[PDB]
Structures are given as structure tokens and as C-alpha cells.
Amino acid sequence: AMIKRPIHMSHDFLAEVLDDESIVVDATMGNGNDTAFLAGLSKKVYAFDVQEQALGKTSQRLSDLGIENTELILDGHENLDHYVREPIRAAIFNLGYLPSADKSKPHTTLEAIEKILDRLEVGGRLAIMIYYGHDGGDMEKDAVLEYVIGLDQRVFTAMLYQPLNQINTPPFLVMLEKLQ
Template sequence: MLQTAMRFSHTLLKEIIQTGDTVVDATMGNGNDTALLAQLVGTNGLVYAFDIQEQALQNTENRLLESGVREQVRLLHQGHETIETAIPEETALRAAIFNLGYLPKSDKQIITKPDTTKQALDALLTRLVSNGRIILVVYYGHAGGEAELALIKEYSQQLPQEEYSVLTYQFINQKNNPPILFCIEKK
């Protein structure tokens, strides 16, 4: 059976992340991706996780403690647009993941936005190692979602093919706007 965009995002992360790596969860939410990243990098690796909602930090902290992987994660109560200053420029990042949209079962007005997502992508690309990946799972069925999807498409399509490979993964016959996955891999 074909993998959902969410499951495929985890497959793409598992393929490249090794113990000791430094990686980013740009939208921690309930910590599902953060927990996976923490397991993959191990105790000698580092995960930077960002969110603007206090509730997300609490949920993620609990999730990490339950899984015994809290130690290797830096939980940052700040937007991913601060990656430029929060993560030193010389840091070599193996991977980053975004789940764009709103936190399920939470305030649907608090959504990721094109401008700040773009700022985060700019900062991540300069820190990404060769063969590193940035994965975006874009939910776009809510108000404001189409604008963000348009930004991601435009941003990733204009990346030079000599430097980056870009993949999209999408179910095109499903109802209710299933998320679309983008993967940017640095050559």
C-alpha cells in the first residue's frame, strides 16, 4: 500500500539520518516528528525543535520524556524564522522537517505563514550538508493554506537543479485536500 505523505516523510528521514547528526523540527506541534528525529540522532546527536505555541512545547516535552529521548532535543519556544540566529551558521544540518498548517485539535487561527516559512528555508539551505534533505508536508485545506502551498511550489521550483533535487509526492484522486510532500535534497 502506498505510504501517506506523513509516513513517507519519515521514510525519507530514516534513509539519511545517522546517529550523531544535527537536525531540525521546524514545527514541533505534538512532537511526533521531534520524537522520531531524536531516536534517529541518538544521545550524541542534536535536534533543534521550534514552535510558537506553549502547548506544543508541553506536549512535545511529555512525548519525549515518555520515549526516553528528551536529552538530545533543544525545545525552542520561538518561530522557525529565527533559525538564522538560533542555529550557528557553521552547524552542519543533515535534515529538517516542516508540517505546515495548524496544530490538530487546537486554535485553527494559529497557522504557519509563507513569509516566515521562506525565512526558515533560506537559513536551512545554507546549513544543509551534501545529500541532506528538507522535507515539507504541506496541509493546505484551511484559510491561508493555498497561499503557503503556492510559496512552497514557487520556492522549490526555482532552486537550481545543479545544486538541488526537488521531489513532490501527492495523492491526486483523494478528497479533502490530503497533504502534499516536498523534499529538497542538496547535491
């Protein structure tokens, strides 16, 4: 019942609409933190990553937890539409900085996001965790943010959840829900 770090809030947010019939997409497997958590709460989790290493780690990890209801895919997440034929209840991305395009082709991640939004059930949710980190970034020139801001409020509700008072610049969360 602590004030939630952005990661705990992403987990809470998605868990809230999950059930034993739910299809979930983990767009950025990495070390499998979100997959390991979401799989126990849904029917099936599809997780994507571009690195063999993250597959191998996540696999042994889910194996050690006895988690079977997943499909780990070695493919860019902009190709989710090829593997996921079901309606999608919840999805999650963990992102770094994506600079808004020079207005003088959307980034592959933007393409995966829209493909997720298109496929979300009504009531379904997309958590986007973003961490600029050491490398640095700018929230006023952020492609994900620019895209989310531009979504039609009648179709989607989009919320920013972010730490205000931390010295090193922390991750922040985008919460999306489909309205119709």
C-alpha cells in the same frame, strides 16, 4: 511495505540520510510527532514552536518516551540560525497554505526554509509537509512551491509527492536534497 502516506514518506526520506552524528532541525514542533520520531535516529534534534502549550505537551511526551537528545526552543523558526551552529543533516516543516506574494520581504517561513537550505550538508534533506485543509488553498498560487520550483536544479533536487485520488484534499510532500 504499504504504499506510503506523504507523512510516512517524509519520515522514510529523512531517516535514509540520518546517523548517530546527525543534527536535525524540526522547524514546526507542534505536538512533537516528527521530533519524537527523528530524535531516536540522530545525534540531536532542535525543534521550534511559537506556543508554550506545544512545548509542554512535547516535553512530557518525549519525557515519557525517555528522549533526551533534543533542545526545544520557544522562538519563531526564521531565527534558527541563532541556535543551530552545526551543519544540518535533515529538516522538516509542517505547513498550512502560504499564498504566493502579491508581486504588486518573504514570509517568515520562506526565510526559515532558505536558512535551512543554506545550512544543509551536501547529501542533506528537507521534507516540507503542506496541508491546506478546511481553510483551503491553491497549488498554483503557493509561496513554498513557487520558491522550490525556482531553485537551481544543479544545486538541489526537489520532488512533489502527492495523493491524486482522494476526495477531501490531503497533505502533500516536498522532498529537497542538496547536491553541492
